[PDB]
């Protein structure tokens, strides 16, 4: 019938793509990088231990200026604190206590939360009245929100459990472009510094790079064997790292369109929950289910240190824009700043 | 000014901490329950009998104890990811229609997945076998036989520790306790005293399900205190 030979052509296209991608293979990152002096064991200590959350922490996000931090907790709070003096500059109660992501605007005046209610709530942190209040209740998605990022003060990118990513105009609230193509539900998204491209990680072991203006998917990356729980762009914008339940974290580049290295050890076993690069890109920091985070050498694929010190599992991980600190949130209701 | 604003930051911090303590007291008092079941399981009937977008939230209180009950309906059937949020609830209220022999295997599989999950492995399950009147009627009917679907029913007898109704009729009792033991075999396969299931027999007419939930939550918290206020 039509379906049989159409799937035959699809498999043929897969064969052609795989052959072309293998033609790009000349040498692995190891074969070029093997003659670089190793970074060496680096030590990072818990400079600050922010506390005040009554339940597990699900997501954190830094700001444009690497001072203010927002944390999302399932007890129903989106409280934000000043990391320098360990002071809570605001506390936001939520209509729905189940929140799985939080976003700090790149202008330090809006914050967004969203969880199982399928509604992205935007709060006005810099209101004239001085009292935080929900600004626009972004509704229309048919699934739990997994990650939201502020493209601008007026545009936001949200990824939900209904296998869709969206671009919302906050002024009106209606969707602008709907990103479809994932078979599974998307868990994490990461905007590029160029703010014209972004990659998404769903539970179908596939990484899809979208373009915000066109609304299509440019390239598709498939190297994992399990659900993707974290994704992050390399600082230059031509690579991105991906975490998964398969106890590995891989790095794909965009131009060659294939994976570069896999960062994993035999005893890792547990999955990866959050991943983020340093500003230079030499160090890849990945959260883990076994109550700790590991510091990976992005080019040597060797462990350089562990940020152990968390009681429960590590849920979120964020490196500041200046790169002077790294913050990890955990399910023990404690957020720690490492430096 | 810097000193003036630095002291200003402290006062806002203190005000937040005063509110946080006032909210921490309410959070620990209130108990959270997750309601799981299929479309025909019968969650609506019980949720109406204790009550009087996306997640449906129902609040009931008994013996001056506040209970928060969540029902997740807006999500898709895929639940391997959003079920991880409820790793801290007091208990998981599982509702199973015992009168449908075709969805029983799916209910057992869901119970097995919930029980052996790494994140919910410490959450006790208050099992609610609902709509027992339909089971009794269909057992006296004889049109549908459990032998067709569950082939271990033939070599099985009601346990001594049973509480049959005066009008239960032994076949209904045997069938009910077969379903309950089918679930309990999964329950006892893995898990220490941290994990436990509390099967209950309920129907659409039952109006005391809230009190049963209260008693089982009392037992769960009692076991937790046995562990933490070291006595165990």
């Amino acid at each position: 019938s039509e379906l049989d030979q159409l799937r035959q052509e699809a498999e043929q296209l897969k064969n052609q793509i795989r052959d072309a991608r293998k033609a790009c293979a000349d040498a692995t990152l190891s074969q070029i990088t093997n003659n670089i002096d190793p970074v060496g064991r680096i030590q990072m200590r818990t400079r600050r231990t922010l506390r005040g959350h009554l339940a597990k922490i699900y997501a954190m996000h830094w700001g444009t200026d690497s001072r203010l931090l927002v944390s999302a907790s399932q007890d129903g709070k989106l409280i934000i604190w000043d990391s320098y003096t360990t002071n809570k500059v605001h506390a936001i109660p939520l209509r729905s206590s189940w929140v799985m992501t939080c976003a700090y605007a790149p202008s330090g005046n809006y914050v967004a939360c969203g969880g199982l209610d399928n509604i992205c709530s935007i709060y006005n942190l810099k209101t004239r009245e001085g009292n935080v209040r929900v600004s626009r209740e972004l509704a229309g998605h048919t699934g739990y929100l997994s990650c939201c990022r502020f493209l601008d003060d007026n545009q936001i990118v949200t990824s939900s459990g209904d296998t869709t990513c969206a671009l919302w105009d906050i002024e009106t609230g209606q969707q602008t472009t709907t990103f479809t193509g994932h078979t599974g539900d998307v868990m994490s998204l990461s905007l590029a510094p160029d703010t014209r491209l972004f990659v998404s990680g769903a539970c179908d072991a596939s990484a899809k790079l979208w373009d915000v203006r066109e609304g299509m998917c440019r390239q598709t990356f498939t190297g994992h064997e399990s659900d993707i729980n974290a994704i992050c762009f390399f600082p230059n914008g031509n690579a991105f790292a991906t975490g998964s339940d398969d106890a590995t974290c891989r790095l794909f580049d965009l131009r060659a369109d294939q994976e570069l290295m896999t960062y994993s050890h035999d005893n890792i076993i547990c999955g990866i929950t959050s991943v983020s690069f340093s500003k230079s890109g030499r160090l890849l920091l990945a959260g883990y289910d076994d109550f700790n985070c590991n510091v990976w050498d992005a080019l040597k694929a060797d462990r350089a240190g562990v940020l152990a010190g968390h009681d429960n599992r590590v849920s979120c991980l964020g490196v500041t824009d200046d790169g002077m600190a790294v913050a990890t949130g955990s399910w023990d209701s404690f957020l720690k700043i490492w430096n | 000014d810097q000193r003036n604003e630095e002291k200003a930051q402290r006062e806002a911090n203190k005000k937040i901490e005063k509110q946080l303590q006032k909210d921490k007291q309410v959070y620990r008092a209130t108990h959270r329950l997750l309601l799981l079941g299929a479309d025909n399981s019968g969650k609506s009937t019980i949720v109406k009998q204790m009550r009087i977008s996306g997640i449906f939230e129902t609040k009931f209180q008994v013996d001056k104890v506040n209970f928060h009950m969540f029902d997740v309906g807006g999500q898709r059937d895929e639940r391997r990811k959003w079920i991880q949020c409820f790793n801290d609830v007091t208990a998981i209220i599982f509702v199973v229609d015992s009168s449908d022999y075709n969805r029983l295997q799916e209910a057992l599989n869901l119970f097995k997945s919930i029980w052996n999950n790494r994140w919910l492995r410490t959450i006790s399950v208050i099992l609610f076998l609902n709509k027992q009147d339909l089971l009794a009627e269909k057992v006296l009917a004889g049109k549908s036989k459990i032998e067709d679907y569950f082939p271990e029913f033939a070599r099985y007898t009601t346990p001594e520790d049973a509480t049959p109704e005066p009008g239960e009729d032994p076949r209904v009792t045997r069938a009910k306790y077969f379903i309950r033991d089918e679930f309990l075999r999964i329950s006892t396969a893995s898990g220490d005293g941290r994990h436990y299931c509390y099967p209950h027999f309920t129907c659409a007419v039952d109006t005391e399900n809230a009190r049963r939930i209260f008693n089982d939550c009392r037992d769960i918290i009692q076991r937790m205190h046995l562990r933490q206020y070291e006595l165990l």
Partner: nanobody, 128 residues
């Protein structure tokens, strides 16, 4: 990329035997517990059997106990399920679904309407 290619589906007389294979190329095999999922015409997806790693802790659904058997060879990344003494009520399409995560004893959404790690599957028909 993860791929699960099924095989063996065909027309068989009621009471015969046919063997269902499942090629599993795209991931490490021995660290995943796989299932079998069927879907009859005019019905939803339903469980058939499940096998853990190393060929232990085997389970079947109640309708096909004894008649069905499941086995895996990690040396070949394959899953088999042998159907013997078929009945007209076994007409369905069989899927070689896999557990979402490795080193895990709980399988979730293996019978969901849209699953990432499940093959297109072969149609098994029984008629006189």
């Amino acid at each position: 990329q993860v791929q699960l290619q099924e095989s063996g589906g065909g027309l068989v007389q009621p009471g015969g035997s046919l063997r269902l294979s499942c090629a599993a190329s795209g991931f490490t095999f021995s660290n995943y517990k796989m299932n079998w999922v069927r879907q009859a015409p005019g019905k939803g997806l339903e469980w058939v059997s499940d096998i853990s790693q190393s060929g232990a802790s085997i389970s079947y659904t109640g309708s096909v106990k004894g008649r069905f058997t499941i086995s895996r060879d990690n040396a070949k990344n394959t899953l088999y399920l042998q159907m013997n003494s078929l009945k007209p009520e076994d007409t369905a399409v069989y899927y070689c679904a896999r557990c979402p995560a490795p080193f895990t004893r709980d399988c979730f959404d293996v019978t969901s309407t849209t699953y990432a790690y499940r093959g297109q599957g072969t149609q098994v028909t029984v008629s006189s």
